Structure 1
Amino acid sequence: GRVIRAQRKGAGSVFKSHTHHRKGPAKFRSLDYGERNGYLKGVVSEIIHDPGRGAPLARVTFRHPFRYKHQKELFVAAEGMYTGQFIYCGKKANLMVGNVLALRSIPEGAVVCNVEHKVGDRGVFARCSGDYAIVISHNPDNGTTRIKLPSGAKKIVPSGCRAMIGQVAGGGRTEKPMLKAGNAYHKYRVKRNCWPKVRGVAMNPVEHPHGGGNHQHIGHASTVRRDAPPGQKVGLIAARRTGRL
C-alpha cells in the first residue's frame, strides 16, 4: 500500500544527479561552415578529471571563425591525446586520433568515439571510458553510414554526422575490484543517491511485491510484463529468458 523505491525515483528531490563539481557538458563544436567545408584547428590546453565520469575531458581552444575572440570547447578525451596537441575538426581534417571528422570522410573499419546521431547534435554515441564505435559501410545513394555501437548493435546514421577518431581514454577502469563498500560509497557519492541497495525480499509487503513471508523468497515469478503498471513492474522486466547462458 506504499509507493515503492523505484516509483519514488521519478519524482526526484533526493535522486537527482549530483553535478555541483562537474565541468559542464562535453560536446563537439556547433556545426558551422568551416567544419562543413574545410577544417578548423584547435589546441588542447588541458586534460581534466570530470567527477562522476570515468573518461577524462580535454579543454580545446579554437580561433573563432568570424569574431575576434577565443572559442573554448570541452571534448571527451580520446586515448593518446596530450596538452599542446593540435586538433583538426572538419570534413577535410586528416584521419588522425583526436581529429573530429564527418563520417563520410572516415574509411570503413575506423575506430571512432562520440558519434553524432543527428547531424549537428555534437555527439551522443560511444562516450564512456574505453568505448568506441566502428564504421562498417557507407551508402552513397541515401547518404547514410552504418556503425557498430559498443553494445554490438548496428545503427544507420546520416553520413554528415561527426565523430572523433580513436577510442575514449580511461579504458579498463571496471576491471579493478573495489574490495570494500567505502569505494562504492565514494564512487556513487558524486553520481546520485542509488547506493546501497536493499533487496526487495528484505522489505515488508507494504513497500514491495517481494516483501513479506516467514521465509525470504519472492513467492512468484520474478519476470514481469512489459505493460505491468508502475509499482508492480519489479524484478526481471520483460525477460526473454533467464539463468545462465
Structure 2
Amino acid sequence: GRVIRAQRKGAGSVFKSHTHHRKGPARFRTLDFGERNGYLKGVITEVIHDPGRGAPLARVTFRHPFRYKHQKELFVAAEGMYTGQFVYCGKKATLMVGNVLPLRSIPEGAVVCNVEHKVGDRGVFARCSGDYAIVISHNPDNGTTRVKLPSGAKKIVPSGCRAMIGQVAGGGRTEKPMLKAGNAYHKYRVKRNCWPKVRGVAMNPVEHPHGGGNHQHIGHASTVRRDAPPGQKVGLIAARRTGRLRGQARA
C-alpha cells in the first residue's frame, strides 16, 4: 500500500491553510490593570470581512494605558455592533451587547461569545457566526463559572475569564443551500485544500482500506477502533453507534 490521503495532510505542503488575504488574528486586548479593575473605552472604526471566516470582524481603537499612542485591536464582531459605537472592556463595564466583561460580572442566563478558557488567553470559545455561550451558574467558593458551549456541552471556567456580551454576527449562514460545485469551490478556495473529496470505495486497495473489489463496497465494518494506527483509521472512528439518529439520540 501507499500513504493514504488522510495521512498526507499532516506533513503540511499542499494542505496548509490559505491565509494570504486574512486580516490577522481576532482576539481581545491583552489583560491589563485597566480591564482587571475598571473599564477602558474603545471605538469601533470599521466592520470588515475576513476571507475564510463567516463571522465579520470589528476594528477597535483604544487609548494606550501608559503610552502616548493609539492601540489597535481586531475583535470578532458581535451581532448589533456598528461603526462609531463605544465599546467598554473591563470588570466594571456595563452589561450591553458588544462590551467585554469577566464572567464574574456577567449574571446567569446571559448570552456571551469569544469566551476565554484561561484567564488572559484572549478568547477561544463561541467564535463562529451565529454561535454563543450561555452562562449557567457561578461558584463563588471555587471562583469558577459554568457555561453552555455551542455543541451543548457544559464546561467549568474560572470566573476571571473574559467574554463579549451578545452572539457572533453573521448567523444563519449555513441555512442557504450552495446549489453548485462552483460555490463550494469558492468557499474552500480561501480555506484550505480539502475539496473535492474522492470516496475511498472509488479508489484502489493500494491507497485506501475501502478500495478495490468487483463492486464498490466497504467489505468490512466502517467503524474502526480508537487505537487503530494512522493509515488504518478511516471511516467512522470509535463510533458509539451508527445509523439514523432517532428519538432521544438526536437530542
Query: SS in structure 1 opposite 2:101?
Result: strand
The structural deviation recorded for 1:147 is 0.1
SS across alignment from 1:10: coil
Identity of aligned residues (%): 96
**For 2:65 and 2:151, how far apart are their aligned partners in 1?**
37
Please give the secondary structure, in 2, of the residue aligned with 1:94.
coil
Distance 1:143 1:178 in 2: 46
> How big is each residue's C-alpha offset from its partner over 1:194-216, in whole Å with a ceiling of 9 and x where there is no partner?
00000000000000000000000
User: For the residues of structure 2 that align with 1:61 and 1:152, how far apart are their CA atoms?
Assistant: 34
**Distance apart, 1:168 and its partner CA:** 0.1
Offset at residue 12 of structure 1 (A): 1.1
**Distance in 2 (alpha carbons) for counterparts of 1:186 and 1:166:** 30
Distance in 2, Cα, partners of 1:109 & 1:121: 23
Which whole-Å CA distance do the structure 2 matches of 1:209 and 1:142 have between them? Answer: 49
Q: CA deviation digits over 1:16-40, x for unaligned, max 9? A: 0000000000000000000000000
Deviations 1:31-57 (A, max 9, x none): 000000000000000000000000000
CA distance in 1 between partners of 2:116 and 2:189 (Å): 30
Query: What residue number does 1:27 align with?
Result: 27
Q: Within 1, Cα distance between the matches of 2:43 and 2:180?
A: 41
SS of the residue 1:56 aligns to: strand
Where 2:9 maps in the other structure, the secondary structure is: helix
Deviations 1:41-84 (A, max 9, x none): 00000000000000000000000000000000000000000000
Q: CA deviation at 1:126?
A: 0.1
So what's the TM-score if we normalise by structure 1?
A: 1.00
Cα separation, 2, equivalents of 1:120 and 1:179: 42
Aligned residues: 245
* CA distances 1:160-197 after superposition (whole Å, capped 9, x unpaired): 00000000000000000000100000000000000000
SS at match of 1:185: helix
Match of 2:88 in 1: 88
Map residues 4-153 of structure 1 onto 2, 5 A cutoff. Answer: 4-153=4-153
Q: Deviations over 1:219-240 (max 9, x none)?
A: 0000001000000000000000
Unaligned stretches of 5+ residues in structure 1: none
TM-score (norm 2): 0.97
Tell me, in whole angstroms, the C-alpha distance in 2 between the residues paired with 1:148 and 1:178: 30
Structure 2 unaligned runs (5+)?
246-251
> What SS does structure 1 have at the residue aligned with 2:197?
coil
1:73-97: per-residue Cα shift (whole Å, max 9, x none)? 0000000000000000000000000
Match of 1:35, SS state, is helix
Task: Describe the SS at the equivalent of 1:174.
Answer: helix
Take 1:225 and 1:145, find their aligned partners in 2: how far apart are those partners?
Answer: 35
Say which SS state the counterpart of residue 50 (structure 2) adopts.
coil
| Structure-1 separation of matches of 2:57 and 2:179 | 27
- Partners of 1:230 and 1:34 in 2: how far apart? 48
Aligned to 1:228: 228
Q: What is the DSSP-based 3-state SS (H/G/I as helix, E as strand, rest coil) of the residue aligned with 1:11?
A: coil
**Mapped partners of 2:135, 2:185: distance in 1:** 38
